[PDB]
Amino acid sequence: PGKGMKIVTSFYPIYAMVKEVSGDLNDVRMIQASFEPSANDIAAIYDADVFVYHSHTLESWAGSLDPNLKKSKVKVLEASEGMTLERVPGLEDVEADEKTLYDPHTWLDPEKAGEEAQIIADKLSEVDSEHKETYQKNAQAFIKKAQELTKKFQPKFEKATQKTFVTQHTAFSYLAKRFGLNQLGIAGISPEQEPSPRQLTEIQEFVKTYKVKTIFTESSKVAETLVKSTGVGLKTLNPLESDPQNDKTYLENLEENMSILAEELK
Ligand SMILES: [Cl-]
Ligand SMILES: [Cl-]
Ligand code: NA
Ligand SMILES: [Zn+2]
Ligand SMILES: [Zn+2]
Ligand SMILES: [Zn+2]
Ligand SMILES: [Zn+2]
Ligand SMILES: [Zn+2]
Ligand SMILES: [Zn+2]
Ligand SMILES: [Zn+2]
Ligand SMILES: [Zn+2]
Ligand SMILES: [Zn+2]
Ligand SMILES: [Zn+2]
Ligand SMILES: [Zn+2]
């Protein structure tokens, strides 16, 4: 190993949490909603030492990887293995295609983000046991700063008179459950899931019922159709599914969106 292990990550939260757990160690990079990585990414995955993805409920293509058939030494790691996933909003009481029932957007909960960084540190310690104390020490520093981020915004959401907000797609369910908030997504779990006409009417009644004055968009066009039907304002709220391309850490990018949400709910 020149720079250490060659680690490849699925998307931005996994790339950020692996990079901060590894720290100075290894060579961490990220492959280039729709998902389906290119032909070169899968080739780069089989040429790497470690590949880390979030969950089978998100990167469904990760389950088709067969390192034994391709004669590859890549060790695929599911960063959220063992974490308890909540039901998809609107499907809580469904008894059971089944992958559509569980919500994967846990990285937006500061507590569950630290839980995923610990699993990454544990799984990296099972592959690279010599540096196990560096992975755990970097993870505990990430968990500590995440738990302090939760303690900081917990009183900020308790005093909020408005605890209901609407976002571009159903991605902030874990964040709302962390601070006792209520949320509704225009689109479903995936941004491609366009609302049906009957569902759009429910979003209209939902905004009117709980006096929602703001729809949080992403940096879609169905959201621009309801700004006339509801008269709400538009503010940005990044679910951190794409790289913000800045010089902030993951928890700093997460805190920024939390501060945008907390100032609006007051
Ligand atoms: Cl329920
Ligand atoms: Cl998604
Ligand atoms: Na509900
Ligand atoms: Zn799994
Ligand atoms: Zn539960
Ligand atoms: Zn229920
Ligand atoms: Zn039954
Ligand atoms: Zn090492
Ligand atoms: Zn070393
Ligand atoms: Zn601190
Ligand atoms: Zn999403
Ligand atoms: Zn900084
Ligand atoms: Zn801070
Ligand atoms: Zn401010």
Residue numbers in the entry: 28 to 59, 65 to 128, 133 to 255, 259 to 305
The authors write:
This is achieved by the ATP-binding cassette transporter, AdcCB, and two solute-binding proteins (SBPs), AdcA and AdcAII.
In this study, we investigated the Zn(II)-binding mechanism of AdcAII by mutating each of the four Zn(II)-coordinating residues in the SBP. Structural analyses of Zn(II)-bound AdcAII variants revealed that specific regions within the protein underwent conformational changes via direct coupling to each of the metal-binding residues. Taken together, these data demonstrate the importance of SBP-metal complex conformation for bacterial Zn(II) uptake.
